[PDB]
Structure formats: C-alpha cells, structure tokens
Design a protein around this ligand. Structure first.
Ligand code: SF4
Ligand code: SF4
Ligand code: FCO
Ligand code: F3S
Ligand SMILES: [O-][O-]
Ligand SMILES: [Fe+2]
Ligand SMILES: [Mg+2]
Ligand SMILES: [Mg+2]
Ligand code: NI
Lengths: 544, 262
C-alpha cells in the first residue's frame, strides 16, 4: 500500500520551493496522516495600493508585474478590465491575437510546470544512474511515441552527462533532494527516471521555443508589450511570415507535448495510481477562456471555448452560471486590518496589518476569496470538470482517453493525480486548436488589419476583466473616478486556491486538499509537495 | 572534475520574471550553463530540496570553502523589521545581508533588485529598497523588467572569466546598457521627420510611425533591445508599443504616465 509513517506532530515546510513566490506550509500530522493545515503566504508587495490615483491606461503595466511566470495574463485581465470600464469592444483581430498569446502562455507555462517544477516530486533523478540505457529505450518504446530522443544512445548520453555532474560532488539544484539515498514514496523504476530526466533537459530547450512563439505576437517574453486599451498595437503580428514562424514553432512545441509531456504524465499517473485517492476537493470555478465573443464580461463567460461555470460538491450534473456579484474576499485570517471581511472586489480594501509568524488568527498575506461562502478550486482541473460536465467535445475525448489508459473512473480525477493530469489534458487540447486559431487570424488579418478600436476615457465608471489563466479564474476590477484609478483590485487564481481560511474559519482548497496526506518520512515530506505543487502555486500572483 | 564557481541566487520581493528571463538564454542554454559553467547552489524556483533541506543547502553554499557569487532577484521590503517579506522565518533583508557579506560579487538581476522596482513605486507600502541601498554595498546591476538573458548571462560569464565589467553611473555594464534604445530604433527616421502616430488605431500606427507622441521612453532609456531583440524574434517597438523605460531606476514613477510624455 501507500507508504505511511506513524509520525505524530507538526511539520513546517518553508520555503516551498519549485513554485513561484514565497510560501510556508504548516501541517499537523497524526499517525502519518495530515489532520490539519495552514497555507501561509510570506510576501506582500501591494500593487493595488500602488495603483490608486494612477492613469487607468497604466494599470496593465503595473499588474503584469504581479507575476512573471504567468506573464501576460495580468496585462490581459487589466486590458479587458479597462476595455469594459470605458465600454469599448475590441476588434475581432485583437480578440484573436489576445487569445492566441494566452494559448502560447498555456503551452509554455504548463510544460515548465510539469518538468521543472513538479517532476522532481515523482522522479528520482539520481536513480536514473542505475538504469540500463538499452532497457530504458525498450521501455520508452512501450510508453510513448517513437522518437530519436528516446533511443538507447540518446538516453545513454543523458545518463553520462548526469553521471559526470553527480560525480563532480557539486549537485547544485539537486543538493539535499528528498530522493537522495532512496525514498519509500518514490515508486518509479530507474529506467523511467532516466526517460523523464532526458525529457526534463529537453524541456529546458523546448520552453525557449514556446517563449519565442509567444513573443512573435507579444513583443517579448517575459512581460509582453502588445496590448493597449481598445485592442492590440502589433500590426506585424497579423502578417504572413511572422504567423508562419509562429505556426512552425508552435508545432514543434506541440510535438514535444504529445511525444514527451503527455506520455510522461501518463506513466507517472500509472505508477502513482494511489494518488487518485489523495488530495481531492469538492467545488470548482472557471471564468472560461478562448472566447469567440469578448465584447463584454457577460459574453466572455458565455462564449469561452473552454467554458465557464461553477460545480459544487462534485456534482457534475449541475454546472451553474458564474455570478460575478457573488464573489467576495475575507481577511479574517489574513494580515489585513479589521473590518475588511465580505468585500466584493469593486469595494475591495487592501489595508496591510502584520502580526507575527504562525499566528493562527492571522497567518497569510493572501486574502480569502469565497463564492456565496464557499471556497472554490480554480485551474486546469476546474476547467476540465466543467468542460467535461458540459460535454465539450475535445475535453470529453481527451479525458476519456486518459481514463481509458489509466483504467480509472472520472471520480478518480478529484485528486492530486487528477489535478496533475488535467494540466496535461488541457495542454493537448490547446495544441490541437493552435492551427485552426492561427489560420483564423491569418485570414482575418489579410483581409483587414484593424487591431485597435477608438475609445473615450469616462469621468466615472467601473469595469471587470476576466481570464482563465494557466492557474485558473483571474479577475481585475476597476473603479474610475475623475478619470483616475479610484480602486483597483486583483482576485487571482492563487488567491482562490492557496489563500487562508475565510471568515467562517473554512479551509481554502489547498488546505482542505492537504487533509489526509500520508507522510512516509517526516524528515522528507514529499507528499506535501506533491499536492501543493499540483495546484501550481504562485504566491506573487496570490498576494500581489 | 574541474570545480565550477558556486552561485547563490536569492528571491526577495520579486515576480520571478527575472528567473524566467534568465532561462531563455541560448548562448549557452541554461542546462549547459548549470552543468558545465557554474554550480547553481541555491535557486528557489527550480531546486529539489524544500523547507529545512533547502535552508541547509543555502548555508552549505554560503560556507563553501571556494566561496560563491550572489545573484539577487527582487527588492527588499524593510517596513516592520523586514517582516513583510520572509523565507524560512527570516526577514529577506537579513538573509540577503548575510549572503552578501562574503560574496565574491553581487549581481542584481532586474530593476527590482537593482533599484527597488515595482513594489517601491509610490506610495511604497512595504518600504521596499534596492539591494545597494538596503545593504550599503556596490552591486552590478542588470536592470530591465526583466533584463534580456543576453545581458544577465553575459554579465555572469564576464564576471567569472574576465573581471568586473565597466559600469555606468547607475551600476549597469556599458557592454549592454551603453546606448539609448532610441539611437538604435528602426523608427528613428520617422522621429527625425516628426512623423508620429497620434493613436494606436491610426493609419500612422499601421505605417509604423514613431511612438513618441504615444509615450515612448526610448529617447531616455539605456538598453540594447532593438539591437539584440528578445526571444530571437521581437521587441516592444517592433510590436507597435512604446518603450516604458523599464531598465531605468524608479521608472514606475519617472516614466509614468506610460502613454504620455508629460
Ligand atoms: S525586475 Fe520586473 S521582471 Fe524582474 S522581478 Fe522585478 S517586477 Fe519581476
Ligand atoms: S518609437 Fe520610441 S525609440 Fe523608436 S524612434 Fe520613436 S521615440 Fe525613438
Ligand atoms: N496562471 C497564473 Fe498567475 C496565478 N495564480 C495568475 O493569474
Ligand atoms: S520597456 Fe524595457 S524591454 Fe526594452 S524596449 Fe523599453 S527598455
Ligand atoms: O503563475 O501565476
Ligand atoms: Fe487582491
Ligand atoms: Mg476586451
Ligand atoms: Mg546532502
Ligand atoms: Ni503567477
């Protein structure tokens, strides 16, 4: 069965590495299982405060620096938010360009997360040295598509590289890894460790290509610079040769997704099938992404090709519409002044007030977003369940492929394994849609290169920008007064998933998901990492 | 087994865009860099160890017999004894001060570590400062939000193989920051002819006219963007958008409003 110690007592993991930003996780363990948890975000910057009084046109440039991992997405949400506030409908070409840059970001972000952030929780890199490269090549032929990168010679070259590195005595990023010397919670055969490690190295190169693709439309990566109120600035991005290069690079990236990412994900999932029984939550939310109509927040919600919705208590038979009026944020268990509970983002308040480390009454810089009083998990798994429940044909097909490959029911996806699988599932789907989306904008751009609409700054208004970023439902909310920012509030996927308890004392999704976590070795609590990383945490996003 | 110079990389008040930028290097790629050239001994974004095991790895590096170079990403939040930014239960300012004391050199990657960056923008609720100000020591600054990996990796390699590069008044290597964005801009002929786009929807904008009237800060920004490009493909002005002046100290406050020159 699943390795589990008899450990009873506290475990603190700070820093949580292989995430963006600064997270401290505290748990109480009893007989080798987590019985209580706290998600404590450890940095505050205060972008909402900084924005007050500024030019609404400036917002997107400040908010994009909420995070450089999910670069672009905040510029997009801010741009959508100001477009809404000034009541401008962006030209079709701008919708297409903005949505393709989001798609390119999914591809880059998800590849890097699986390999460079998450894989080390499941893959013992040093055990790869024990593998026979010939047996590894044979195994690779049996879990993944044929490719020269998986040949015995290629895998041997990787092993030889890793061997020289380890034997140097300078382990670098692998220093003190939880897998050193072996670990009961690490299940993979050496051959699979070697295959995954080879791909990990390949993925470091392939992510450069995914970023290049993104920058053809985005201007640069990280931190794109092509969005403006009313649309986009990048006329060259509508033209033939840039788009052919965009297509070519995207195809290389997608070949890697299909040749390496999904196959490695599925192999990991098969070996760690027990993780389908760990780390589940019950409620899911998405604002949707990849809309055919982004003229308004209402139209975004309704026409998102990755649909919006709300699932409650795992009931896939009842996907509700998103009520943007029902979102609010509590600060009862957060490092903010008293009086700030129950605030809809249009009425948001950001009044920082620190107490002390591990104050169980105030233990995080994140606010606690709630939906009609319920915590909501956001991100690939939420999108995946919502799309699946709605019978979105691409999600139905791919989810069923995964379920049939692993021989597990869809209910097994309410887990850390499912959360991890969903991320791959949607990456395959974005990939399958790239060519169609590119052709649509190429044809549209060739006929008429309108890219930015005229608009007028109102004296007083409000607006909201929605996006489903790689990590989930993102919203930016502005109040304009005297043509300046009177209030600007970010409610971010990380805030939904990793914030602290709400005003009712109710655990956030990551805190709930951590309950029941087995701990095989309290000294090296990789299981905590497996679940936390599966949520793809971004603390700079979460706190801003 | 040739010894590789130890590099300790700290993350303070940052967005991780500078880490992301660094791994876009292609000369060499990041794997070749950390396998062959440096020993990257602490790096929160990608390191295997977490929690106490990670903290121990940091202290091991800091105590390494051969010494180490320090890379700092992010500004330092100093309000309330530095407690608004913490790692492992220690204020970021405390850990950075400790790491810097014995560093062979300090490279600040990004405008945040160099100059204070986005969190230092008015009204600076965390009382964030740049590293040089917070520590009272000279730093090699690789600013931009984020900097080009060409500039960061080139600096690191220069430092390990040649010495400290010549720096300008703001601590930036002249190799990469010696020229104005504007002096190398393909739209310069339009600027000279007073051919400016009045809006992003205008025919002037479609025709690639100069973006100065739309707030371009190229004329006052030191960086190599139009010469080297980003991601081997593009840069902001090529994508039709004005330069924000993101490699300039305190640009959040000196270069705003971004879409004006006022
Ligand atoms: S300089 Fe810019 S990209 Fe780098 S950490 Fe600071 S905000 Fe992020
Ligand atoms: S677009 Fe900017 S950098 Fe280029 S010529 Fe005009 S002002 Fe100078
Ligand atoms: N994806 C992403 Fe970043 C987070 N959490 C945002 O928005
Ligand atoms: S905004 Fe920054 S990246 Fe270059 S073009 Fe201007 S200095
Ligand atoms: O990363 O958000
Ligand atoms: Fe917020
Ligand atoms: Mg819009
Ligand atoms: Mg060790
Ligand atoms: Ni982020």
């Amino acid at each position: 069965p699943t390795p589990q110690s008899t450990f009873t007592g506290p475990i603190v993991v700070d820093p949580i590495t292989r995430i963006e930003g600064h997270l401290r996780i505290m748990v109480e363990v009893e007989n080798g299982k987590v019985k209580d948890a706290w998600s404590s975000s450890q940095l505050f910057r205060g972008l909402e405060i900084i924005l007050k009084g500024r030019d609404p046109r400036d917002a997107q440039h400040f908010t994009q620096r909420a995070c450089g991992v999910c670069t672009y997405v905040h510029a997009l949400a801010s741009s959508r938010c100001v477009d809404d506030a000034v009541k401008v409908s962006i030209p079709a070409n701008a919708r297409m360009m903005r949505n393709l840059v989001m798609a390119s970001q999914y591809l880059h972000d998800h590849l890097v997360h699986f390999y460079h952030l998450h894989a080390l929780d499941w893959v013992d890199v040093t055990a790869a040295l024990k593998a026979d490269p010939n047996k590894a090549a044979k195994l690779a032929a049996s879990i993944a598509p044929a490719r020269p990168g998986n040949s015995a010679k290629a895998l041997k070259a990787v092993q030889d590289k890793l061997k020289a590195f380890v034997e140097s005595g300078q382990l670098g990023i692998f220093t003190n890894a939880y897998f050193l010397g072996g670990h009961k919670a690490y299940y993979l055969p050496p051959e699979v460790n070697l295959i995954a490690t080879a791909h990990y190295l390949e993925a470091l190169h392939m992510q450069v290509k995914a970023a290049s693709a993104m920058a053809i439309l985005g201007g640069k990566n990280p931190h794109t610079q092509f969005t403006v109120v009313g649309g986009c600035s990048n006329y060259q991005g509508l033209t033939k040769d840039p788009l052919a290069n965009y297509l070519a690079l995207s195809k290389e990236v997608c070949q890697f997704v299909n040749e390496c990412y999904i196959p490695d994900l599925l192999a990991v999932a098969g070996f760690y099938k027990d993780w389908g029984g760990i780390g589940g939550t019950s409620n899911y939310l998405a604002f949707g992404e990849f809309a055919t109509d982004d003229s308004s927040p209402s139209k975004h919600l309704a026409t998102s090709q990755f649909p919006s919705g709300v699932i409650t208590g795992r009931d896939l038979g009842k996907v509700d519409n998103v009520d943007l009026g029902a979102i609010y944020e509590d600060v009862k268990y957060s490092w903010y002044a008293p009086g700030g509970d129950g605030k809809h983002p249009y009425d948001g308040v950001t009044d920082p007030k620190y107490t002390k480390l591990d104050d169980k009454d105030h233990y995080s810089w994140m606010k606690a977003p709630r939906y009609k009083g319920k915590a909501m998990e956001v991100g690939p798994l939420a999108r995946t369940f919502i799309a699946y429940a709605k019978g979105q044909p691409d999600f139905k097909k791919v989810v069923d492929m995964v379920l049939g490959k692993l021989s597990v029911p869809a209910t097994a996806l309410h887990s850390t394994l499912g959360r991890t699988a969903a991320r791959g599932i949607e990456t395959a789907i974005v990939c399958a849609n790239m060519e169609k989306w590119i052709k649509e904008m190429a044809d549209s751009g060739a006929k008429d290169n309108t890219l930015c609409a005229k608009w007028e700054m109102p004296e007083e208004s409000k607006g909201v920008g929605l996006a489903d970023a790689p990590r989930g439902a993102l919203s930016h909310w502005i109040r304009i007064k005297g043509k300046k920012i009177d209030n600007f509030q970010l409610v971010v996927p990380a805030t939904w998933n990793l914030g602290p308890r709400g005003a009712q004392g109710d655990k956030s999704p990551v805190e709930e998901a951590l309950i029941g976590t087995p701990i095989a070795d309290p000294k090296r609590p990789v299981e905590i990492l497996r679940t936390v990383h599966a949520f793809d945490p971004c603390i700079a996003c979460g706190v801003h | 087994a040739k010894h590789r110079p130890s590099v300790v990389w700290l993350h303070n008040a940052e967005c991780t865009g500078c880490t992301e930028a660094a791994i876009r290097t292609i000369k060499p790629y990041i794997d070749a860099l950390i396998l062959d050239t440096i020993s990257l001994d602490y790096q929160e974004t990608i390191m295997a160890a977490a929690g106490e095991a990670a903290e121990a790895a940091l202290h091991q590096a800091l105590e390494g017999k051969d010494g180490y170079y320090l890379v700092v990403e992010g500004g330092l939040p100093t309000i309330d004894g530095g407690q608004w930014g913490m790692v492992a239960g220690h204020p970021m300012i405390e850990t950075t001060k400790k790491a810097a004391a014995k560093a062979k050199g300090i490279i600040c990657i990004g405008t945040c570590s160099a100059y204070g960056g986005v969190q230092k923008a008015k009204p600076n609720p965390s009382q964030a400062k740049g590293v040089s100000e917070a520590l009272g020591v000279k730093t090699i600054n690789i600013p931009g939000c984020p900097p080009n990996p060409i500039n960061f990796v080139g600096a690191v390699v220069h430092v390990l193989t040649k010495g400290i590069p010549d720096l300008d008044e703001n601590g930036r290597p002249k190799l990469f920051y010696g020229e104005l964005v504007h002096d190398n801009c393909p739209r310069l002929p339009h600027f000279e002819a007073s051919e400016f786009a009045p809006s992003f929807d205008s025919e002037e904008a479609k025709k690639g006219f100069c973006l100065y009237e739309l707030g371009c800060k190229g004329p006052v920004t030191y960086n190599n963007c139009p010469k080297v490009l980003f991601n081997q493909v593009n840069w902001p002005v090529q994508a039709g958008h004005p330069c924000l002046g993101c490699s300039e100290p305190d640009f959040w406050d000196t270069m705003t409003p971004f879409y004006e020159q006022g």
